[PDB]
Amino acid sequence: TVPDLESDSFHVDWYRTYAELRETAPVTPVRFLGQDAWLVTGYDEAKAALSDLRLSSDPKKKYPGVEVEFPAYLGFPEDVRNYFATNMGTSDPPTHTRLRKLVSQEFTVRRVEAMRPRVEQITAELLDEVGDSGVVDIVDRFAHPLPIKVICELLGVDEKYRGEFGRWSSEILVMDPERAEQRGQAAREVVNFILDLVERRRTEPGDDLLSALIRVQDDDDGRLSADELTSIALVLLLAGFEASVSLIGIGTYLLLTHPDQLALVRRDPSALPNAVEEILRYIAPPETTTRFAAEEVEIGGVAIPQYSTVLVANGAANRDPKQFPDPHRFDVTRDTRGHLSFGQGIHFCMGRPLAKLEGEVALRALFGRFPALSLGIDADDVVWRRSLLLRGIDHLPVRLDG
Ligand code: HEM
Ligand SMILES: CC[C@H]1OC(=O)[C@H](C)[C@@H](O)[C@H](C)[C@@H](O)[C@@H](C)C[C@@H](C)C(=O)[C@H](C)[C@@H](O)[C@H]1C
């Protein structure tokens, strides 16, 4: 019986489901969105897969008699897919190399650190607005607005252009065959929004990251083409805040349900950085990441046939007991080195410095401002986003004063 990634087994106590699969076959056939695929749940296997470049990240490449379909582009018209997939994460070397090197020249640690004061101020202002007591949805009031405001400032997106794309991005995070048309339509809205944003930045340059990317170049890697610039801007906008929203929300939930863990962090401030790493290891937002077998590729003693769609379960790998002992225990003091929540290999997250900064500042500020913060509902009643693309929490009631 081939597992169906659409079943509740993968959205209800799903890490137990992953453990059962890993135990039987760390690399096994599955069904998803009406197509055959291979799910990799073992840590060694997942790391090997992400390191094997025969497993391509480019959905635009064409192969004779093959119709390449990445689950994440469900409902996307071809031109829209291209707008979404002409960037680092959707490119293979040598294209990937050139794009990443050019973007790395401007998306630096220096630029990220320069934003630290802004992240702190935005965080402070959002917390100032929730009051001192009562129940509030910490996602709508904090976890979601902080990252979205930060990415907008990083990319030169004016205030008048912010309270809208969040809704489209949300529809895109879920992959429901029933809403394939609406998903494709939300995608087109994001494209149109980015096209107007780039147009505005080209005519009115600033000191933001997008303005800089419009000018970036180098003798060897040349520069970003119009299509590359637009697509990179699009992914930087979406990935630039959604993963962070998931981190802050999941992090808040985990600390609220692990009193011992929270106490330790509050006790020793130097322990916060690793707490964020453990939060990402425990429940990775990018639960699975997709690859396409350009050639036959053997992983874990299993021959993945050419043209196969491979779903590397980053999250499942993080709970492989062979790599992370007592994997189901959330321990902010554990050695988290090696987790795959930021990827592995040439596509390793470019936003890691900003993600860690946002998580550290956000959680430190939230739990520091509200010492009696408690969950507004039973832990078992929290609703987890039904998505293998980006796991997270969209609504989380909390009691500001316990
Ligand atoms: C907690 C938050 C974050 C997590 C968990 C995360 C996770 C990841 C993962 C798993 C990958 C590799 C994907 C693959 O192998 O196909 C990745 C790639 C990347 N991330 Fe993040 N990310 C986060 C935040 C950010 C932020 C804030 C930005 C931008 C502002 C960002 C920009 C990117 C880019 C551009 C890549 C593509 C790199 C490449 O393909 O060479 N990430 N991220
Ligand atoms: C709809 C499909 C796309 O998803 C998204 O952009 C999601 C909103 C983001 O949260 C994803 C999950 C990121 O966080 C990173 C893991 C990967 C990202 C940087 C890529 O480059 C990747 C090609 C990506 O754009 C697509 C999978």
Swiss-Prot record:
A Gene Ontology biological process term: erythromycin biosynthetic process
GO MF annotations in UniProt: heme binding; iron ion binding; monooxygenase activity; oxidoreductase activity, acting on paired donors, with incorporation or reduction of molecular oxygen
EC code(s) of this entry: 1.14.15.35
Cellular localization per UniProt: Cytoplasm
Keyword Oxidoreductase part of the UniProt annotation: yes
Binding positions (heme): C349
Taxonomic superkingdom: Bacteria
Phenotype on disruption: Gene disruption leads to the accumulation of 6-deoxyerythromycin A, an antibiotic with increased stability at low pH.
Pfam families: p450
Note from the entry: The bound substrate forms no direct hydrogen bonds with the protein.
Protein name: 6-deoxyerythronolide B hydroxylase
Name of the gene this protein is made from: eryF
